[PDB]
Amino acid sequence: PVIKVRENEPFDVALRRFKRSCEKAGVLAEVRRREFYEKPTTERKRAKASAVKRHAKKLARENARRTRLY
Amino acid sequence: RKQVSDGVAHIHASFNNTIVTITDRQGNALGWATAGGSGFRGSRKSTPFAAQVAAERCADAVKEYGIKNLEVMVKGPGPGRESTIRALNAAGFRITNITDVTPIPHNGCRPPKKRRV
Amino acid sequence: FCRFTAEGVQEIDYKDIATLKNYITESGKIVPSRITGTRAKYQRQLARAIKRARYLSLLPYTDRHQ
Amino acid sequence: PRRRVIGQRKILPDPKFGSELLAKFVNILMVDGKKSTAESIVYSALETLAQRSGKSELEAFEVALENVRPTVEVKSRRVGGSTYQVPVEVRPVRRNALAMRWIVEAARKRGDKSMALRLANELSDAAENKGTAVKKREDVHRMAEANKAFA
RNA sequence: UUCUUCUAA
RNA sequence: AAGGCGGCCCCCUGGACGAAGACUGACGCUCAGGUGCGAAAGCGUGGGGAGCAAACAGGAUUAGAUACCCUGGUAGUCCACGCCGUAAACGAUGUCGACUUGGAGGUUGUGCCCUUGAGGCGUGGCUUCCGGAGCUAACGCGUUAAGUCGACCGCCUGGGGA
Ligand SMILES: [Mg+2]
Ligand SMILES: [Mg+2]
Ligand SMILES: [Mg+2]
Ligand SMILES: [Mg+2]
Ligand SMILES: [Mg+2]
Ligand SMILES: [Mg+2]
Ligand SMILES: [Mg+2]
Ligand SMILES: [Mg+2]
Ligand SMILES: [Mg+2]
Ligand SMILES: [Mg+2]
Ligand SMILES: [Mg+2]
Ligand SMILES: [Mg+2]
Ligand SMILES: [Mg+2]
Ligand SMILES: [Mg+2]
Ligand SMILES: [Mg+2]
Ligand SMILES: [Mg+2]
Ligand SMILES: [Mg+2]
Ligand SMILES: [Mg+2]
Numbered sequence A: 001p002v003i004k005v006r007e008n009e010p011f012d013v014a015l016r017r018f019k020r021s022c023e024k025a026g027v028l029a030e031v032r033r034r035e036f037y038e039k040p041t042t043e044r045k046r047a048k049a050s051a052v053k054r055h056a057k058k059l060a061r062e063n064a065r066r067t068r069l070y
Numbered sequence B: 001r002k003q004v005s006d007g008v009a010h011i012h013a014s015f016n017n018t019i020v021t022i023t024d025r026q027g028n029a030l031g032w033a034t035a036g037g038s039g040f041r042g043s044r045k046s047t048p049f050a051a052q053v054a055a056e057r058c059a060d061a062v063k064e065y066g067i068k069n070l071e072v073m074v075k076g077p078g079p080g081r082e083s084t085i086r087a088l089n090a091a092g093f094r095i096t097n098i099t100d101v102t103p104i105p106h107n108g109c110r111p112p113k114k115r116r117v
Numbered sequence C: 001f002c003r004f005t006a007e008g009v010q011e012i013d014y015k016d017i018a019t020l021k022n023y024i025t026e027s028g029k030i031v032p033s034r035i036t037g038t039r040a041k042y043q044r045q046l047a048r049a050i051k052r053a054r055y056l057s058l059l060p061y062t063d064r065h066q
Numbered sequence D: 001p002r003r004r005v006i007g008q009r010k011i012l013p014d015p016k017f018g019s020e021l022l023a024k025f026v027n028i029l030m031v032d033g034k035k036s037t038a039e040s041i042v043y044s045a046l047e048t049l050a051q052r053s054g055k056s057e058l059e060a061f062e063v064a065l066e067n068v069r070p071t072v073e074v075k076s077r078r079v080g081g082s083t084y085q086v087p088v089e090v091r092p093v094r095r096n097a098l099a100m101r102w103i104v105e106a107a108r109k110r111g112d113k114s115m116a117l118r119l120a121n122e123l124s125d126a127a128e129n130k131g132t133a134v135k136k137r138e139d140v141h142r143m144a145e146a147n148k149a150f151a
Numbered sequence E: 001u002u003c004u005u006c007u008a009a
Numbered sequence F: 001a002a003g004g005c006g007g008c009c010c011c012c013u014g015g016a017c018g019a020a021g022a023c024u025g026a027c028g029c030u031c032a033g034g035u036g037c038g039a040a041a042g043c044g045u046g047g048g049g050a051g052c053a054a055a056c057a058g059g060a061u062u063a064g065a066u067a068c069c070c071u072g073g074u075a076g077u078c079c080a081c082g083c084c085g086u087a088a089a090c091g092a093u094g095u096c097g098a099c100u101u102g103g104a105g106g107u108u109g110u111g112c113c114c115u116u117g118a119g120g121c122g123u124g125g126c127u128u129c130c131g132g133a134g135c136u137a138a139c140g141c142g143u144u145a146a147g148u149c150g151a152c153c154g155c156c157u158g159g160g161g162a
Helices: A011-025 A026-034 A040-066 B048-061 B084-092 C002-009 C040-055 D020-029 D036-053 D058-067 D092-109 D115-127 D132-145
Strands: B008-014 B017-025 B029-034 B069-075 B094-100 D072-076 D085-089
Touching: A011 B084, A011 B094, A026 B069, B008 B084, B017 B084, B017 D085, B029 B048, B048 B084, B069 B084, C002 C040, D020 D036, D020 D058, D020 D092, D036 D058, D036 D072, D036 D115, D058 D115, D072 D132, D085 D132, D092 D115, D092 D132, D115 D132
Parallel strands: B008 B069, B069 B094
Antiparallel strands: B008 B017, B017 B029, D072 D085
């Protein structure tokens, strides 16, 4: 996130630009992931539960798209 | 005191404390202040307000070196990740660069075990 | 919308930096296949080519190291 | 309450001055429903208060009222292992209500004989910016910036 | 932040 | 094959699959005993030792705290060569073969259409999810069966004691 302040730019623009690239490059969640040791059991289980979360919610959103509520 | 015009602001924003260090472009440090050194303790010193007065102390200590331009390297995750450079602008410094310099290994040394809290 | 499936190359060249600079980010990380839409056969070839161009100092490992 | 924001009741103005605020002050002074005595104490203490200052009774009351109005109070939140005193901004109605309570509460604690002597001396000191009522104003403000890290 | 246990038909 | 395998490069090397043919001619399947492989922890000898970390020490916490939390920290983790032969070694589902409605994918070949674009039509391998008949105590399984059958093996017989 090496960000140079452009010429005639307000500081609140560049700070908001700096928050954007750090969320883009994934810095805060990377260090928080490496703060403690995660077992290869815990890493394989959390990644598998993340896939079922991305899949059954896709099926729940499409099933709720069909039928009405009132 | 030798006057210097441009400078580098290192910010070591951890979870427990924020360390602000004004240095030159060579790494020879000019002055520093920490959030724990700003009259705060424990839960109070791990706050984004603690860092933005830590930047005010640190900018006051390099007043005599005559700094007008300053670029900022930011290291670590913390509450003073953002609130430091707001007050560091508020000292009257024309900002130049905001670089993110957190150390990221490519799965190097093993981190400690998880806190069973 | 994979580009390599359209142009049809048998193997991505690591020496073609200007192609490979369209697949790394500003901080030098390899852009995922979700974003560029690269078919996963060429994604393995592309990652194997970026890792070779990093070794020959044709691409940086990150934007920070110096 | 949980459910609704309420509609507050309307207060009469005082008979002497027509001020809504001074009649809010006589209610805070009033104990046991005896408004007639509390009407007499306020009108006796504010009589000698304007005597010491030469201004209007309504004008000189606000001067002592100005120096006891808090600007930021704190409140307990306690989301962690201990109590967090978060400094919350106080709305201008409660600013006026906390001030009149502190003047009355300080006027109970003085050692003068008459209550109107206890309250006129406290108002004359509050316009002079001393007394227990402005000391209560300080401890609220002192606890405010001692907890300004919480927001 | 810590925060245990309760027999008889 | 299972355990397992993750920068990049070279050397040696096993298996799978596909497309067309060519060829051998039942040469097959399973398997007691047997033999081989087999995570981590551990053991032996010799190295290595950054980080992490049992043990242990100190600090806290608490009624106590031989714990969780903290600050340290030794075997160990790493390498070579041996040994151990165990795990919730799990899909808690032995291997092999045949048949039985479908849908949405992933991955990896291959044929065809003018590739008139990343498309259109097929045809193989592997894999994920949902689900019909059927099955099942139910949960569910459901062409990768726990459906319908065949071959062979391993195993079960109330809970403790074990
Ligand atoms: Mg720690
Ligand atoms: Mg007991
Ligand atoms: Mg023949
Ligand atoms: Mg066999
Ligand atoms: Mg071992
Ligand atoms: Mg031993
Ligand atoms: Mg050993
Ligand atoms: Mg040894
Ligand atoms: Mg050591
Ligand atoms: Mg420890
Ligand atoms: Mg066993
Ligand atoms: Mg396993
Ligand atoms: Mg599994
Ligand atoms: Mg078993
Ligand atoms: Mg099903
Ligand atoms: Mg049956
Ligand atoms: Mg069967
Ligand atoms: Mg059954």
